[PDB]
Structure formats: structure tokens, C-alpha cells
């Protein structure tokens, strides 16, 4: 027969940890390190009353699996006898008793998982000596579907057939007892780990090598500039459709994509190779998007880069579900019949796509997608949220964190979504427009005073960066330049002073005219294809094998030398782009007004003004009536000398084309790049190291931890092809002539912008981490991930640091 099972359940929970030292309250140990106190954890479940089922579980388990699956067909089981010792005494001795009996009529041999080597007849009682000496539990780390820690137990003395089998163990790789973690798991951490991956021939030193690192980094050198170029011309690809269309037409952020799926696919598969088609099908998969398709075929049209990509996590169930992710490519099972059996498998699947909640957070809402059928996508597959802007946002982020010296449009990104709004701009509305709402509209909408206190964005931003850098135009930055409708569209006040739909009425347009007209020239002029064909990289030396060193448990860089001349060409700054940002000032003929506010009626001449009329005018001293006879008829000449004719427009033309407004043609040269500047870099003597990803995954790369980089931008010619002046009718000529005098100090101080805001060598130190993926998605780099020994843990805390798994002690 068998044994009985009086303790067969098994039902367990779980542990925790306790913070320690400085280390955060996001407590992520991983094994070493703690090996005596696991075995405390052990012991203080080992002792206790839910202790002795989960032996018995055990016990079970083994007398099941390791004795009558190889019998039991011709050897009958019996155990009678059964106690257990397992007392707070924590110790081990164990007394039980088996016997075992055939009824078969033939002679046959006990198939046992030991030592088993002897002839066995009919109706043989055969013995089975159980008996235990005093010994204490080791731990075995479990393969559980989590991989935690192994709160469990390595025996090492049982006394059986008169013997002793040396650390055996009863079912290994198992056991009932359900003592998983989820904070602390098993491994090498992160320096035992940096401990038997590194060192003469060992893994990571045999599996890199020179051309390879020597190609890794001039082709993460190649991929940074040419995705600095599809960004370019993304930014310039959009900005012509936003600014190219009437005003009475939406055309939103996520029509616009519409334009540059192709762009957005050769970005995404050259950041990331197989990656390229998947965002084109994803911007397929909106509302706006020309054909509408569901969510399956998107998830499957790839499966290695999705799975990878949302499930990354630390583990615990990527290389797990790796025993089943090639099986889930198998037969691709075959068409017409992959997709019902991928729903199927969806229910085994779908662990690991909830065990999310990191940077990527669209996995539950896949699951929901995938778990059933979704059909209109023009808002059902809209309110997920974790839509095509969302995940933009995520994986530039990811970007970022890879390549941090672009931080400007991921920053400048980061308040465009700060806001839990602007998210029907990623839909059916129109971009320019309502992020005008957004960025340039004092939103006071109501009718009883003024709601006037709800500052524009963009004047927020410009005001945080041209805050105080001069003091002069600061007033009138606020008064003609911010004050304004073209900075700050004051809706619902056009629709309060008028309210009757005049041309210049409606301030969103006359603001949206000159913003779109410099979207629709950066789009055509600056950062056009054609236009952007000219920013060229070429090799300087990319020649020398980066050879290794290796000096035992390390792995160095002996020395690097690339440099990049980055031929700029011929990059028209052209003169036309600074003539829509013009238009952003008003071109009303009420000149004198302004002159006679900034200069005379201020807050800084009056103060001169009347100290003036006081005294002053040293040597004369008596005579105090000639003041009110100075500060006359030079306000006099200087305001005479102003052609009523002409506007602030005219003035500020003059300040920086040149010659005046409507006599410049955009054909001409405004600023042309030339010459170019050169990326350098380089570092000698520079250590390398297994490098993970920003959390633990199975794909170890390699890191070059060290490298100088040199920027130099000099090498350069910013000219001004309007350097001198032509004029016909300037706004101030006369004997006062601002119009030349400003024209000498922009130049002045645009020469001096483009001398020390630009070049000064800027250099820089950081580590590229490349994880140099193969042919067909096959990373050279990588690990057993078998074996208790290899499991790295980049999430854990050193000990070294000084880690206690106690309260505060």
C-alpha cells in the first residue's frame, strides 16, 4: 500500500527584510553576504508549528516521486512507522521505516535514486534501513517560477543501507514549503558576480574581444549622429505639416505621425535593431492612423523584441518563461491557426506580463488588450493612456539614460507632458494651435473683473531662460514682448472687448500665423532633407585595434583614439526664420509711444531725470534753469529723428537683418554655419566589466568604464553674411540714429554669444555601456543561467557598504 499522510497540506508564506545602514527603504539584498542568516530565516520556520507538515509534504513528496514511479507496478510499498523530531531544538534525526514487498512471481532489481545495486527475488520483504544522525540543515536555492532565495534546505547526512550517501539529498530542486522572497534573491551579487565572470580566460574576457569593441564604439559613435540626424529631421518633417496648413484644419501630434512612420521606424530600428517595424505598426494602431488594426498582430509581428521589451524587470520570469519562449516560436502553431493558439497560451503567458510596474508600464494594459478582443480603437484603444505619446516619452527617456548629453528634448518633453492634460493632442486636434491654448494664452475665462493671473507656458519658459541677463529689455520683454497677444493670447477677452468676430479679433490666429510660419520655414529652409543633407560625419582615425588587458580578476582598455570632423557645410540659417520670430513682435505704427515709455517715462531715466532738475551739471552749479532746457530738445532730436512710418517690426529688422523689413528677401544669407567641429574621444588605462542593464537581465553586455570625452566646437565660422549696413530709411535715422547703433551692437553681442557660448572644449567623462547585439537579435555576451553560481544580481547592496537583515541593529 503506502504511508499516511496526516500533514499532506502545504500552504506557506512568505518573508521580509528589515532596513539597515543608510541604504534606502527599497530594500533589494540579494544572497552571500547574509548565508548565516538564511540560515537563521530557515531555522525559525524549521522550529515552529507550520514546520512539520511542510516535512511532511517533503517526505511526501520524495516517498512519491524517488521510490514507486520506478516500482510499484512490481514492488507494494508499506510504512508503518513515522515520527518526527523537529522541535524548537531545530536539529536533525529522523526515524522512519519502509518496507518493501513484491507480489509478482519473477525476480527484479529496486530502481532507487542512490547506490542501488542488488538482485531481488519473489516475495522478498526487501529492508530498507531508515535511520539519522545529528547533523544541521544546509539551504538549496529553488528554481521556482520567481528564483528567490532558497529557504529551504541541503541535507548532508542521512545513514541508509548502513552507509552514508555524502550531501544527499531528498528531491532536489523542490519542496513544499513555499518560502519565497520579493525583495532578496539567490546569485552573485554584483562583485562575486565581477569575481568568477572576469578574469584570464574566463567568460567575459573570452567572449569580447578587440575589433569587436572597436566596432561597438564607432558604431554607437555612427548611431548617436545619425539619429541626431532622423531627429533633425523629424523636426522639420512635422514641423511642415504643422505650419503648411490653412488655419480651419486640425492637424494634431498624432496626425502628424502619419508623415514619419517610415522616419519613426528607421529611428526605433536603428536605436534599436528589430525595433523599427514595431513603432510603425503602433502608430498604425491609433485613431488617427490611415488603416486601423488591432492589437494581436502588433504583439506578434516580432515576439522576441515584445517580450523583451515589456515582459526590463530584474528576472524572475523572462529566462524562465526563455524554456517556453522558444517553444512559443515554434512552427510560426503554424499560420491561420497561430493566433487562436497564442490566445490560448496567453493564460501561461500572461504571469510574467503582470509582473510589471517598471519604466515600461503598458504591460497590463496589453494583457487586457490581448486577454480579450478589441475592435473600434478610435477611443476604446485611446483611454489606456499608455498610448504612442506615452511610450515615446518612456523610450526617449530610456534614450536619455543611455546618451545623456541630448537632455534638452527630453527635459523640454517632460513639461510638454507634465501637465495631465494635451492629451487630445495625441488624437484629433491640431497641434500648433493648441499648444498655443497651451503655451501662449492667458487663460481668464470668465466675465466678472479679470482671470487674467494664469501666465502662458512659453512665457514661463523664456522667462526662466532669458530671466535677468540684461536689464534693458526686461520691461519691455513684459510689457510689448509678453503683455502682447502674440505672446499671450488672453481668450475670452477678444470675445470681451469686441464680440463681434472681427478679423483681428480672433488673437489665436494672428499669434498661430507667425508661430506656423516658423514652423513651415524650419520645416522647408533649415531643417529641411535637403538642407540637412549637408551636416556631414566622417572617420579621423577609427583605425587602431582597441586591444584588452587583463590583470587577473580584471579587464582593461589599454588606449582609444576616434575622432569625428563633423563637417557642418553650409547650414543656412537663413534669413526668413528669424523674420517669422519678427512677426512675433508687433508691427502696429505707434513707435513713439513705446520709444517715449522704455527711454523718457520709465523707471530708471526718470530717476536721472530729476535728479537733473534738482542739481547737477557740475561747473555751472547756479544755474539750474537749464536743465528743463536739456533734457528738451534731446528728447527733441531723438524724437524727431523717428520715422512715424515705420514699426517696432522695422526697428528690430534693422537691429538684425540690416537694412529694413519688407526690402529683405528670404533668399539672401542671414548665418551659415562653417567649418567644422570635431568629437574626441578617447582614455587610456580604463577598466571593463560585465555591464547590465538598468536593472538585471540574462543579455549581459560590457561597459568601458572611463572614456574622456573631448568636445571640441571650434574650428568654426558663424557668419553674419549681413555684417554691415545698407539702410535707405531707417526707423531712427537722423542725428540720433538708433537703427545703426543697434545694428553695431547686436553684431557686437552676437559675436560675442557665438565666441564664448560656443567652443571652449567642453569635456566631459561618462561610461558607454554597448550591448552589442548580433546578426538575428543573438547578443555575443552571455551566461549559463543555469547553475546557483552564475545568477547575478545587479539589484543587490553590497555588503561591503554593510548590510544586516535586522531591525535598525
Known amino acids: 500500500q503506502p504511508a499516511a499522510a496526516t500533514r499532506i497540506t502545504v500552504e506557506n508564506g512568505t518573508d521580509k527584510l528589515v532596513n539597515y545602514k543608510s541604504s534606502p527603504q527599497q530594500l533589494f539584498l540579494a544572497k552571500n553576504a547574509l548565508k548565516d542568516k538564511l540560515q537563521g530565516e530557515f531555522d525559525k520556520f524549521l522550529s515552529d508549528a507550520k514546520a512539520f507538515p511542510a516535512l511532511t509534504a517533503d517526505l511526501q513528496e520524495w516517498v512519491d ?16 512507522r513515522s515520527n518526527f523530531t523537529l522541535s524548537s531544538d531545530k536539529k536533525a534525526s529522523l526515524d522512519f521505516i519502509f518496507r ?63 552507509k552514508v550517501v555524502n550531501k544527499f539529498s531528498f528531491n532536489p530542486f523542490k519542496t513544499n514549503l513555499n518560502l519565497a522572497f520579493s525583495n532578496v534573491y539567490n546569485g552573485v551579487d554584483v562583485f562575486e558576480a565581477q569575481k568568477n565572470l572576469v578574469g584570464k580566460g574566463k567568460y567575459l574576457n573570452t567572449h569580447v574581444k578587440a575589433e569587436d569593441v572597436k566596432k561597438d564604439v564607432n558604431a554607437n559613435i555612427k548611431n548617436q549622429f545619425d539619429i541626431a540626424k532622423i531627429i533633425a529631421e523629424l523636426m522639420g518633417k512635422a514641423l511642415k505639416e504643422f505650419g503648411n496648413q490653412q488655419e480651419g484644419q486640425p492637424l494634431s501630434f498624432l496626425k502628424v505621425m502619419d508623415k514619419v512612420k517610415e522616419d519613426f521606424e528607421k529611428l526605433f530600428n536603428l536605436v534599436r535593431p528589430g525595433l523599427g517595424k514595431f513603432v510603425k505598426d503602433l502608430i498604425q494602431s491609433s485613431s488617427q492612423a490611415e488603416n486601423k488594426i488591432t492589437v494581436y ?102 534614450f536619455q539614460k543611455s546618451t545623456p548629453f541630448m537632455a534638452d528634448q527630453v527635459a523640454i518633453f517632460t513639461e510638454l507632458f507634465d501637465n495631465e492634460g494635451a492629451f487630445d493632442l495625441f488624437g484629433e486636434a491640431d497641434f500648433v494651435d493648441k499648444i498655443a491654448e497651451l503655451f501662449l494664452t492667458k487663460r481668464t475665462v470668465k466675465n466678472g473683473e479679470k482671470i487674467e493671473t494664469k501666465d502662458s507656458l512659453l512665457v514661463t519658459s523664456l522667462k526662466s531662460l532669458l530671466g535677468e541677463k540684461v536689464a534693458a529689455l526686461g520691461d519691455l520683454l513684459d510689457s510689448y514682448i509678453f503683455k502682447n497677444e502674440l505672446l499671450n493670447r488672453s481668450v475670452e477677452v477678444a470675445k470681451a472687448e469686441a464680440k463681434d468676430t472681427k478679423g483681428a479679433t480672433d488673437y489665436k490666429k494672428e499669434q498661430a500665423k507667425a508661430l506656423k510660419k516658423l514652423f513651415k520655414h524650419i520645416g522647408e529652409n533649415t531643417l529641411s532633407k535637403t538642407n540637412l543633407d549637408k ?51 508687433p508691427d502696429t505704427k505707434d513707435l ?22 534738482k542739481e547737477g551739471f557740475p561747473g555751472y552749479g547756479w544755474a539750474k534753469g537749464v536743465v528743463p532746457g536739456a533734457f528738451e530738445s534731446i528728447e527733441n532730436t531723438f524724437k524727431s529723428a523717428i520715422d512715424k512710418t515705420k514699426s517696432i517690426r522695422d526697428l528690430f529688422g534693422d537691429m538684425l537683418f540690416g537694412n529694413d523689413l519688407s526690402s529683405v528677401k528670404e533668399t539672401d544669407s542671414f548665418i551659415t554655419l562653417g567649418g567644422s567641429f ?70 557686437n553681442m552676437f559675436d560675442s554669444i557665438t565666441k564664448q557660448i560656443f567652443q571652449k572644449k567642453y569635456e566631459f567623462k561618462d561610461n558607454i555601456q554597448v550591448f552589442a547585439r548580433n546578426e538575428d537579435n543573438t547578443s555575443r555576451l552571455e551566461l549559463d543561467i543555469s547553475d546557483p553560481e552564475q545568477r547575478v544580481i545587479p539589484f543587490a547592496f553590497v555588503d561591503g557598504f554593510g548590510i544586516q537583515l535586522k531591525a535598525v541593529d
Open 100 to 162: 518493501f514487498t513484491n507480489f509478482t512471481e519473477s525476480v527484479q532489481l529496486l530502481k532507487l535514486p542512490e547506490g542501488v545495486s542488488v538482485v531481488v527475488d519473489s516475495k522478498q520483504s526487501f529492508d530498507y534501513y531508515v535511520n539519522a544522525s545529528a547533523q544541521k540543515l544546509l539551504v538549496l536555492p529553488l528554481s521556482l517560477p520567481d528564483y528567490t532565495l532558497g529557504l529551504n534546505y541541503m541535507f548532508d547526512h542521512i545513514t541508509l543501507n548502513g
Open 535 to 585: 551636416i556631414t560625419l566622417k572617420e579621423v582615425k577609427n583605425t587602431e585595434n582597441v586591444e584588452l588587458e587583463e590583470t587577473e580578476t580584471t579587464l582593461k582598455v589599454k588606449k582609444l583614439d576616434v575622432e569625428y570632423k563633423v563637417e557642418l557645410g553650409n547650414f543656412e540659417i537663413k534669413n526668413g526664420l528669424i523674420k517669422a520670430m519678427l512677426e512675433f513682435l
Open 65 to 80: 516521486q524517488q521510490l514507486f514511479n520506478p516500482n510499484q507496478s512490481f514492488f507494494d510499498l508499506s510504512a508503518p
Open 678 to 747: 570635431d568629437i574626441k574621444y578617447g582614455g587610456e588605462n580604463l577598466n571593463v566589466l560585465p555591464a547590465y542593464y538598468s536593472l538585471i537581465n540574462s543579455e549581459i553586455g560590457y561597459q568601458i568604464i572611463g572614456v574622456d570625452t573631448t568636445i571640441d566646437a571650434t574650428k568654426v565660422k558663424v557668419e553674419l553674411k549681413n555684417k554691415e549696413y545698407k539702410g535707405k530709411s531707417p526707423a531712427i535715422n537722423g542725428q540720433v540714429k538708433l537703427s545703426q547703433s543697434f545694428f553695431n551692437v547686436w553684431t
Open 297 to 398: 498582430k502588433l504583439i506578434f509581428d516580432n515576439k522576441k523584441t515584445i517580450l523583451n521589451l515589456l515582459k526590463e524587470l530584474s528576472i524572475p520570469e523572462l529566462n524562465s518563461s526563455l524554456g517556453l519562449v522558444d517553444v512559443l516560436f515554434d512552427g510560426i502553431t503554424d499560420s491561420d491557426g497561430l493566433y487562436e493558439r497564442l490566445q490560448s497560451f496567453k493564460d501561461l503567458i500572461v504571469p510574467a506580463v503582470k509582473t510589471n510596474e517598471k519604466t515600461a508600464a503598458l504591460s497590463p494594459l496589453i494583457e487586457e488588450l490581448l486577454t480579450q478582443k478589441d475592435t473600434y480603437v478610435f477611443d476604446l484603444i485611446q483611454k489606456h493612456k499608455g498610448i504612442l505619446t506615452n511610450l515615446l516619452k518612456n523610450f526617449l527617456a530610456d
Open 592 to 613: 513713439e509711444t513705446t520709444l517715449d515709455k522704455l527711454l523718457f517715462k520709465g523707471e530708471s531715466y526718470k530717476a536721472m531725470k530729476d535728479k537733473y532738475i
